[PDB]
Amino acid sequence: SSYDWLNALNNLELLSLHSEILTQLRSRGVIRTKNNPVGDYAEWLVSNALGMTLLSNADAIDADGLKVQIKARRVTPDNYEAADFDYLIAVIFDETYNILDAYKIPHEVIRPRVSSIKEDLIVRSSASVNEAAM
Amino acid sequence: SYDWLNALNNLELLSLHSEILTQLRSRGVIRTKNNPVGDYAEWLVSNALGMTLLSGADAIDADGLKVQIKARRVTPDNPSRQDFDYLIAVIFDETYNILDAYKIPHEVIRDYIVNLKGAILTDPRVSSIKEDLIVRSSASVNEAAM
């Protein structure tokens, strides 16, 4: 909830804490690499919530066998593909990683036909997380 | 250490991860959210040696030469050590203390993906700059990297 206490850490403590977090997430299987943690988390969220299988390194195959792209973005004050997939799922997080929006974008949409999946993703992800905690 | 991280949920871990990076960006230590170990290396070498960071080359040094800056943190998984005038290569241990820091002229890279092992480190055109980083850094920075 609160992060002003970060002001009291030195840069080396922040950096060591940062890596321990990524070690913790990797050990839980939430992120598969240290390179893009927000993207890896979205992929873990969407795959578990919607019954998709992740691909190592399309990002996933869904429950009907379609090829899916998963991209994520976090809202703050601060600032082609030539590969085939059937649709993109785009997740937008707030500062504390609550889902602001989630979009299903068929590949055909380039540069309307895209629909929100926000409610379905939140519901099935909340069931997923609470179930796993058991 | 930070064993209390085990008591957080994944949403809290990621929120903290992003707030840490925002804190570092606000201090000018990290410049982008993508390469924090590399951005820290650049902050370290630039402040120690009086370089200006660029948004091809990563920095201009105090004599106007173009510098590439690369960093690596050695972890339990592996300890492998793998237009610009020279490259500066920093190697951190797990807790971000500097194991080694090398100055590698572009000419040396041509003659040799570069492996900081064996003959490249004994090439007279290559120098360690760890000692220079320690001397020339401020006592505030130096107290972190002892």
Author numbering:
A (entry chain B): 7 to 63, 68 to 89, 100 to 131, 155 to 177
B (entry chain A): 8 to 62, 67 to 93, 104 to 133, 144 to 177
Cite, word for word, the article reporting this structure:
The BisI family of restriction endonucleases is unique in requiring multiple methylated or hydroxymethylated cytosine residues within a short recognition sequence (GCNGC), and in cleaving directly within this sequence, rather than at a distance. We present the crystal structures of NhoI and Eco15I_Ntd (N-terminal catalytic domain of Eco15I) in the absence of DNA and in specific complexes with fully methylated GCNGC containing dsDNA. Both proteins are homodimeric, with each domain involved in target sequence recognition and catalysis. The crystal structures show that the modified cytosine bases are recognized in the context of double-stranded DNA, without base flipping.
NhoI is a typical BisI family member, Eco15I contains an additional domain at the C-terminus of the protein. We truncated the enzyme to the shortest active form of the catalytic domain (containing 173 amino acids) to increase the quality of crystals and refer to this truncated form as Eco15I_Ntd. Crystals grown in the absence of DNA contained either an NhoI dimer, or two Eco15I_Ntd dimers in the asymmetric unit. In the Eco15I_Ntd crystal structure without DNA, the relative orientation of the protomers is very similar to the orientation seen in the DNA complex. The region of β-stands β7 and β8 is disordered, so that DNA binding channel is open from the ‘top’, presumably to allow the enzyme to load onto DNA. However, the hairpin of β-stands β7 and β8 is much better ordered, likely because of crystal contacts to adjacent molecules. Together, the data suggest that NhoI and Eco15I_Ntd can latch onto DNA thanks to an opening of the DNA binding cleft, and due to flexibility of the β-hairpin that closes the DNA binding cleft at the top.
